[PDB]
Amino acid sequence: PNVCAVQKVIGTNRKYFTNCKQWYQRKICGKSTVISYECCPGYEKVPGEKGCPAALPLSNLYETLGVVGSTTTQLYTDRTEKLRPEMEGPGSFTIFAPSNEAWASLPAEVLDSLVSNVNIELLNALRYHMVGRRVLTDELKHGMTLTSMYQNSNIQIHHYPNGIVTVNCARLLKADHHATNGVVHLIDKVISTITNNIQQIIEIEDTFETLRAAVAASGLNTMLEGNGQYTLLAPTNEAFEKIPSETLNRILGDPEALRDLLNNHILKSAMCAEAIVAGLSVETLEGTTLEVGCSGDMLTINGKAIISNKDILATNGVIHYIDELLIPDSAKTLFELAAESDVSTAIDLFRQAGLGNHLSGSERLTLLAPLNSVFKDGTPPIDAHTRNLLRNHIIKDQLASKYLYHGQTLETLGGKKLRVFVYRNSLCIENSCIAAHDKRGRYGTLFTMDRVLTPPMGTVMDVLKGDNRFSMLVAAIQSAGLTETLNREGVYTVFAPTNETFRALPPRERSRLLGDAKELANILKYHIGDEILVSGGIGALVRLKSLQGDKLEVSLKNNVVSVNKEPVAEPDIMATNGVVHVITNVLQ
């Protein structure tokens, strides 16, 4: 009876006292926990019975400090020889009592100045830790400010979905210990008054001289002086200095990039370091998502141990000092956001082909860069053919792929026009289809694609006549009167059989297809779909109506296209009026 739970990390003395819960973090930062059982606030064990059935009497506020083990706090109250009678006397009070470890965590210079002068500075600090009314934890989760008993100075309270409550970002260790004249709460640090806002702290600290100048240039000083609850991830001078000067000055000389940069360091609520016991997704003011986490007593952002100072308190929120600049994708050039990504092979080939200048400045372009896996068996060599193909992977204007439409045409650097095909579960531009979300830079946008592009060469008949494998097919096309259909404008899907497919027709079938041209016309129209279906547009199963009227069964399995259970030998050969797919048997 009345049995409370303690979740202790292993290695430590870091402990989490709760209102008996069942949701447990298996790991806290990176160290697993064990759970144990003690008696709850206000219950004591009896020997020979299980649980803790006996309640203990209440005592006054001074005496209750010993019960929760805050004995250094108790000793210093008695030292003042003024505050101890009040804690034993009439009234209703709350005290946030620092733990013994907290008092021992004070630097020697701050410990020295209060205990030297007991009446003055020790009494004043202690009053800031108190409130002139009883407050239970039910009124502590609201997040409001409380007025302390030191000069009516505000205390800032924060609450998080995991139940952790903080008092000036100090963790609340032991909650809701009732007293005869109030309640005692044990907290994890010694807290101090909060007199500066975020902007004032920036102007004071010499380590933020570069940051201070950036804030001024954006005109953001109005927001950082005002009321609000924010977290700032504040970059030191050394963080700025780790960035190459040509990159960094480019940002600072661009009003838009500067604003996006700074917004990526600001969060919409105040978040204390003690809040974070697992990976959490947060959204910045710029829009990028960051994964906040921790490894031991080191806070980490996206796996990098770059938080060098936690819990700097302001009147309008919390500041954490950060050792690396968090440059968002929207502040980066096209080269910067892709150089270390999944398309890094392709980026190197643009550089070797002389096209790196297109990616490195401010031109409004869209880059179609295939994935590294396309180039698994080797890179193509840098000829004039490869050079020409690469110019046609750079699209005029900065575009967003979710706003693309079917009848849109995309113009390349040189003079060609590429067609967009939007399907239900994939989006394609000529033969190449988007394989992951866009990365939007400041001036250009990277589309990640699954394949190298193949721009079209002439009509369907231009494709088939240029290859000796379709000599029997071309004569058959001509005999049926279909040649001029496929040399004019259109949106065809041609499953084009080779000579070796014709070489499989039985003798009885081979000469019955030759004579009966009205029958030949009807057979051929069954092989022609009425819209352009590239291989990256099929997904699982699509029916495509033929010109004869009946439907073909098209499917995609293990990256291989099948049509009516016949595999395609060579897909996605582009033509100005359609697409040609090679097949190795004739359909019926």
Numbering used by the authors: 46 to 633
Q: Could you give the paper's own sentences about this structure?
A:
The principal constituent of the protein deposits is one of the most abundant proteins in the extracellular matrix (ECM) of the human cornea, transforming growth factor-β–induced protein (TGFBIp). The function of corneal TGFBIp is elusive, but its ability to bind both integrins and ECM molecules indicates a role in cell adhesion. TGFBIp consists of an N-terminal CROPT domain followed by four fasciclin 1 (FAS1) domains (FAS1-1, FAS1-2, FAS1-3, and FAS1-4). The X-ray crystal structure of wildtype TGFBIp reveals an elongated banana-shaped molecule with the five domains arranged like pearls on a curved string.
